[PDB]
Ligand binder design. Structure first.
Ligand SMILES: c1ccc2c(NCCCCCNc3c4c(nc5ccccc35)CCCC4)c3c(nc2c1)CCCC3
Ligand SMILES: c1ccc2c(NCCCCCNc3c4c(nc5ccccc35)CCCC4)c3c(nc2c1)CCCC3
Ligand SMILES: *[C@@H]1O[C@H](CO)[C@@H](O)[C@H](O)[C@H]1NC(C)=O
Ligand SMILES: *[C@@H]1O[C@H](CO)[C@@H](O)[C@H](O)[C@H]1NC(C)=O
Ligand SMILES: *[C@@H]1O[C@H](CO)[C@@H](O)[C@H](O)[C@H]1NC(C)=O
Ligand SMILES: *[C@@H]1O[C@H](CO)[C@@H](O)[C@H](O)[C@H]1NC(C)=O
Lengths: 528, 528
């Protein structure tokens, strides 16, 4: 019986699932860790105590306790990201989609969701691995990890809440795949981890962390890189924010043991309800609890590590989307709404730059302004809107990622870079949002292959090309089958376009703006 | 007899001159000042002692003692600028081209040559006023003024060499036109002063200097503005350079009386031979002896004057040329030669920016670099060449001029702006030099109207349009005859293109680059 598998942790019973007029196996809800509840909250995950009896792996598990977006109640565009299961602190589970007939030892892809480290579930319809598993004969895993305070509260020094535990959760799921994936027909020596948003940052962080390097083969990062401004904080700032969280909940701030015991008493929703209140006011596009450069998971600064070659050397495939900033502006910069064209005013354009760079003086702001202002027309609302869109994009995702790929390529064993700029025919978000942060995921997981979803036939083509590049890379370290996506080299910096037009290669992705963000601006803020 | 005129200073006898199959009058070599020789050198001009008898005004006068360019011996492209008369310190003369029959009271245009304040004559074939006088029924005057040390040696405090005397020379010629031009049929209440290079800077300086404002009606500035970096120095720096000049000639440096008496003993060629030796090494595109902000001719800083509206309020017509920087690069930045395409190397591109902005740190240089580098291609010699061309242009002529026209327009009574980008069919300089600093002059003085000069028939058209705009403006304050050149306003910043294609209006001339040079860079150098 395919639906029955015996793992090092216990027998597991999966279920048969329909897919594109066929069927495959799916082991949903397998536990890889001990519920991080009660006195466990904020602690490193503990591995799941093995079990006798068969484990029902027929249905999706709970989603982790997280912030739920209600900006647009009922709107599909935003509800597709919210948890679609019951939220609980007992949420450390992974899912497996195994081809049928079960393979003997095939390519494994492990998905790490994103959500800025404050949100995210592995059970979203956009993360249904059945299409990719089926269309590409790959074993697909999707893991889960604690988010928000629950997975990132950091009181450096304490062992009750050292921080980064959400990343350890991830690592535990990865350890589990290394130890049992063979029983489902996956080859542990060929697992590719891939993620988008905080998931891409997370993927990058296991490339850096020595303790994670040996649990996977290759990596794929989508619109996220470890060095992104929103992905990490110092132990100093983490502690600052952790204290501040107790201040919001009326906790004895005497000692860490005290702090933690109160925080541990509060009901989940209580920490969620005040958790955005610790975010300092000069961090409008970031979230409160994120990975900490703690000296253990991250031996030194990400920058020195990137600089010295201190990281796993393998092949990597990463990329970004056309309009990375629209999401951030929509949810965090006034003047941008879901239903207007959100045209911006010169006066207001500048409050957005001031808003997207508090760490800058009237000189650094001028510098950003001069760089994104169109001096002959400048009173144009659209251009101003789009200018802010690019600023927030370039600064928060694209340029950090380009800096990472430039550094990574120096020591790596093959880099592949993409620029996804297709606007789905059925997008429910407005025109001004463009190709949105999060929207290449649909195509990577092959939702276009299902007619009910109203995509164009060519979009079914794009998704199929992407799914095949993704899986072919996972299987070989090269997206191309033995019309070629060229390696990204330090010299020629080539990359491709992912869209419906026929593939075209380009060079030096947003170099101009990224040389500004990466090299110039820093030197200037420092030199002033 | 037309050729005889009686002025407040003496009778003067001119001569008949042929022009475009016709004839006109020309009074060449009329003295407006007492020879500034002997104990006079470095002193304010003295007005010419009147005379009895008729003055022979039949032939061009001597040219002032100046540096003679021999970079390209025999080459027409550069020899057309060299003095074509005998050089002498007795050179303060003006020329007059009067229509025939002599007018009763017509438009007067007074030409002030340029030459960076180190060179220039009023007798160059490009400055032959006969064509413009004839084609437009205007009385045309061309003056002369001492240049180099002779006209600009500044020892603030001394009365033997206070500085700015070359500008006073100019003013004396202007005073003379105000007092006698009626006798030649010119209307003193309608004189327009116009000049190019230091001549345009000079024109601007009489708009600023209270002592000059009443000697003319309107002004025209061509590729020069008073605030240009190469047009002025502090009394401090002027004195510094004056001492340094004595050090080069073995002069007692005890006191100003001493210094000046030795400098006054040296033969002209002796000061010319060592005069570029005082130029500080962080001033590669400037010249040694230039106007000084002395508190008298210039009451305060040009910037405050421009800022407070402290200047003659009238109509002005000014403009710049496409490739203002090529001349400066050719004569002062290695790697640019008259006979190669002068392609530049990335490594070398940066030595040119470092070369064109010593007053900047590794941050200000980076800033210039980021602004003129094409990040995707950048190893391209042409683009690098052209990048340096624009940097030196924008910084030395165009942006200072745009800053002047923006400030001037705020208080003025009508501003007209042009962008001359026509490359003469018969240009003898190389392709990479483009539309050269100095090369619109040919068209303003109507050399194209003469077939022998090998211009195209359409270039005869362009020259005629320009000559008519220039004279029509001089006559009315508006280049347009009662296809319109629009006023340049602080709001719409419109300007036209001067070339052979049919006229097209544009907006905000090189705003992007000039906001960098005018507002951004300064703030940055200061803030660091
Ligand atoms: C107070 C309360 C909520 C806030 C907030 N919303 C957070 C809720 C939005 C998450 C929905 N989930 C989403 C995800 C992706 N793309 C989306 C694209 C459009 C809309 C929602 C998206 C990519 C993968 C990760 C999840 C955000 C901000 N500040 C807040 C301040 C700053 C900009 C980022 C979002
Ligand atoms: C040592 C010795 C001479 C130097 C020099 N030559 C000065 C001689 C060139 C003047 C010829 N006279 C010229 C004029 C115009 N355009 C030209 C355009 C092309 C060639 C010569 C030109 C516009 C009106 C003013 C006169 C120059 C420089 N440094 C020198 C360092 C720095 C760049 C400016 C010229
Ligand atoms: C597995 O759990 C689900 C949860 O509702 C249940 O409906 C299903 O029947 C279970 N399967 C078995 C055979 O235990
Ligand atoms: C990857 O590494 C292997 C040996 O370790 C080498 O043969 C191969 O060419 C490398 N490829 C790249 C792009 O570095
Ligand atoms: C005017 O001076 C020139 C100088 O050579 C001379 O040739 C000419 O004959 C003179 N004219 C008269 C009538 O004095
Ligand atoms: C120039 O000034 C006069 C009055 O001094 C005024 O009527 C005219 O409109 C002004 N033009 C401009 C452009 O300022």
């Amino acid at each position: 019986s395919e639906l029955l598998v015996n793992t090092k942790s216990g027998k597991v019973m999966g279920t048969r699932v329909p897919v594109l007029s066929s069927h495959i196996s799916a082991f949903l809800g397998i536990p890889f860790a001990e519920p991080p509840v009660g006195n466990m909250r904020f602690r490193r995950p503990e591995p799941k105590k093995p079990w006798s009896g068969v484990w029902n792996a027929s249905t999706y598990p709970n989603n982790c306790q997280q912030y739920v977006d209600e900006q647009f109640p009922g709107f599909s565009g935003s509800e597709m990201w919210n948890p679609n299961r019951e939220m609980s602190e007992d949420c450390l589970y992974l899912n497996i989609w195994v081809p049928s007939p079960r393979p003997k030892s095939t390519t494994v892809m492990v998905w790490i969701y994103g959500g800025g480290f404050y949100s995210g579930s592995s059970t979203l319809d956009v993360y249904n691995g059945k299409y990719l598993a089926y269309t590409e004969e790959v074993v697909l895993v999707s893991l889960s990890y604690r988010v928000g305070a629950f997975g990132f509260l950091a009181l450096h020094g304490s062992q009750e809440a050292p921080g980064n535990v959400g990343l350890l959760d991830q690592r535990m799921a990865l350890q589990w795949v290394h130890d049992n994936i063979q029983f489902f027909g996956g080859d542990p020596k060929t697992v590719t981890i891939f993620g988008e948003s905080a998931g891409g940052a997370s993927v990058g962080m296991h490339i850096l962390s020595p303790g994670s390097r040996d649990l996977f083969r290759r990596a794929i990062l989508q619109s996220g890189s470890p060095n992104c401004p929103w992905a990490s904080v110092s132990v100093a700032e983490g502690r600052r924010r952790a204290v501040e969280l107790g201040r919001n909940l009326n906790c004895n701030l005497n000692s860490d043991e005290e702090l933690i015991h109160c925080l541990r008493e509060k009901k989940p929703q209580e920490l969620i309800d005040v958790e955005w209140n610790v975010l300092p006011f000069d961090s409008i596009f970031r979230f409160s609890f994120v990975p900490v450069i703690d000296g253990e998971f991250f031996p030194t600064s990400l920058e020195s590590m990137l600089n010295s070659g201190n990281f796993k050397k393998t092949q990597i495939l990463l990329g970004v989307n056309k309009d990375e900033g629209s999401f951030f502006l929509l949810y965090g910069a006034p003047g941008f709404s879901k239903d207007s064209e959100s045209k911006i005013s010169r006066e207001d354009f500048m409050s957005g730059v001031k808003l997207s760079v508090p760490h800058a003086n009237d000189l650094g702001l001028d510098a950003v302004t001069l760089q994104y202002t169109d001096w002959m027309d400048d009173n144009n609302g659209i251009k101003n809107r789009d200018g802010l869109d690019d600023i927030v994009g370039d600064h928060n995702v694209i340029c950090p990622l380009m800096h990472f790929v430039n550094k990574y390529t120096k020591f790596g064993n093959g880099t592949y870079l993409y620029f996804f700029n297709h606007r789905a025919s059925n997008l429910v978000w407005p025109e001004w949002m463009g190709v949105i942060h999060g929207y290449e995921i649909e195509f990577v997981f092959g939702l276009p292959l299902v007619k009910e979803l109203n995509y164009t036939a060519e979009e079914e083509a794009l998704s199929r090309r992407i799914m095949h590049y993704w899986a072919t890379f996972a299987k070989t370290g090269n997206p191309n089958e033995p019309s070629k996506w060229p390696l990204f080299t330090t010299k020629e910096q080539k990359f491709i376009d992912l869209n419906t037009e026929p593939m075209k290669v380009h060079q030096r992705l947003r170099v101009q703006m990224c040389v500004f963000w990466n090299q110039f601006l820093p030197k200037l803020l420092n030199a002033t």
